[PDB]
Ligand binder design. Structure first.
Ligand SMILES: *[C@@H]1O[C@H](CO)[C@@H](O[C@@H]2O[C@H](CO)[C@@H](O[C@@H]3O[C@H](CO)[C@@H](O)[C@H](O[C@H]4O[C@H](CO)[C@@H](O)[C@H](O)[C@@H]4O)[C@@H]3O)[C@H](O)[C@H]2NC(C)=O)[C@H](O)[C@H]1NC(C)=O
Ligand SMILES: *[C@@H]1O[C@H](CO[C@@H]2O[C@@H](C)[C@@H](O)[C@@H](O)[C@@H]2O)[C@@H](O[C@@H]2O[C@H](CO)[C@@H](O[C@@H]3O[C@H](CO)[C@@H](O)[C@H](O)[C@@H]3O)[C@H](O)[C@H]2NC(C)=O)[C@H](O)[C@H]1NC(C)=O
Lengths: 48, 52, 53, 105, 49, 53
């Protein structure tokens, strides 16, 4: 996660996607309907 | 309608007959365990491949 | 084409800051902000529907 | 000017006479327009972005803009251990001090 | 006693069609050359692997 | 931050503000602020105006 290669695929048009982004769902805040999560940002952008 | 021998604290109301469908945003609750689907919208302004 | 929003309506959504520093349910709310473009253009998704009345 | 209460108007001194002007003309600015959370008489409660100057202005009856600028280092102290720029949807609550919008002497 | 069900997943964005990095393996290189020869006072050009 | 807003039919303002780190990536080897009269062209990606499917 967070590095080059966090999401990978054999070819751009392929539907086989491997993703290891450390996606953990978090408890929503009281009185709200949002869906919070703690996810490592895109490793491709950080590489860029 | 009127309901007798009641307090506003102990009743719930909602609007149910929805004649239009909206985006299944994560900021609104879901209807059931599965999705209603039933509509689709294309996302405009595709990424395109230019010179700066 | 514009004929996709025929049976769709906008929605109110929770917003963490409605201008006065207090969260509230707003007619306009930001869903996703996409900045994949490298020239800086932003594609902002909001609960409104613009161009269709 | 008639000593009555009207939240849609303000009075400014013009020469020797108080005169009336629209409240919607009033603006507060540091580097981007501030959001005026409240007004009462001489006092304005606003939220301002980071900046070093602060200006207050309005438009009078003769449609002539007036404004005043003062040097003022506006930098809110950091609450907690993260320097966030806007109120987040998910998080923690910490003690702080604010100006409650009550005009009660 | 109310409950909230939160589910999410990761997909490759449509931008993967345009903005992407291609990770390749490299093998032996097919060298090619372009050569100018002054042959009998005439400039000739050759191109060969 | 990123704030999106509009004016209501009742002439009241609605706005929603989200924290969002916006900083366009550098195209080329020079950190410029507006496209110049005279220069060079480099590949990039943008959002076109097309509204088709
Ligand atoms: C924007 O411009 C860039 C470069 O200017 C361009 O990048 C190229 O994208 C294509 C995908 O459409 C990549 O694949 C190429 O596409 C042709 C289409 O005729 C295919 O024949 C090839 O794809 C295959 O190539 C692999 C090589 O082994 C195969 O293993 C695999 O199965 C692929 O299907 C051909 O490679 C192309 O590689 C890139 N170019 C580079 C330098 O990376 C892009 O297409 C342009 N358009 C958009 C919308 O972004
Ligand atoms: C055969 O080719 C050689 C070199 O190949 C040349 O490469 C490029 C420069 C292109 O001009 C190609 O078209 C060409 O094939 C020639 O030798 C070079 O000739 C040029 C003539 O323009 C010389 O330039 C001159 O240089 C003098 C001194 O600096 C200036 O005063 C002139 O104004 C002019 O710029 C160049 O120096 C020369 N290079 C050498 C000798 O190493 C060659 O003339 C050509 N012969 C034939 C028969 O085609």
């Amino acid at each position: 996660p967070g590095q080059f290669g966090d999401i990978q695929s054999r070819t751009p048009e392929s539907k086989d996607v491997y993703a290891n982004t450390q996606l953990v769902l978090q408890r929503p805040a009281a009185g709200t309907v949002h869906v919070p999560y703690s996810q490592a940002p895109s490793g491709f952008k950080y590489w860029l | 309608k009127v309901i007798n021998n009641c307090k506003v604290d102990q009743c719930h109301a909602a609007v149910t007959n929805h004649k239009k469908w909206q985006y299944n945003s994560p900021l609104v609750p879901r209807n059931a365990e599965l999705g209603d689907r039933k509509g689709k919208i294309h996302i405009p302004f595709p990424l395109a491949n230019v010179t700066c | 084409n514009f004929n996709v929003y025929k049976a769709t309506r906008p929605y109110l959504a929770h917003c963490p800051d409605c201008g006065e520093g207090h969260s509230c349910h707003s007619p306009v709310a930001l869903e996703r902000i996409r900045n994949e473009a490298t020239d800086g253009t932003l594609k902002i998704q909001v609960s409104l529907q613009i161009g269709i009345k | 000017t008639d000593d009555s209460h009207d939240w849609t108007k303000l009075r400014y001194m013009d020469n020797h006479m108080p005169a009336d002007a629209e409240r919607a003309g009033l603006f507060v600015r540091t580097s981007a327009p501030c959001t005026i959370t409240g007004t009462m008489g001489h006092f304005i409660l606003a939220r301002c972005p980071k900046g070093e100057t602060l200006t207050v202005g309005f438009t009078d009856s003769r449609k002539i803009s007036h404004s005043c600028t003062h040097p003022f280092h506006h930098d809110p102290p950091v609450i907690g251990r993260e320097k966030f720029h806007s109120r987040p949807q998910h998080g923690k609550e910490l003690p702080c001090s604010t100006y409650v919008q009550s005009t009660a002497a | 006693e109310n409950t909230q069900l939160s589910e999410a997943h990761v997909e490759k964005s449509e931008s993967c069609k345009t903005e992407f990095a291609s990770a390749y393996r490299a093998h032996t290189a097919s060298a090619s050359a372009k050569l100018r020869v002054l042959y009998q006072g005439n400039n000739i050009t050759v191109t060969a692997y």
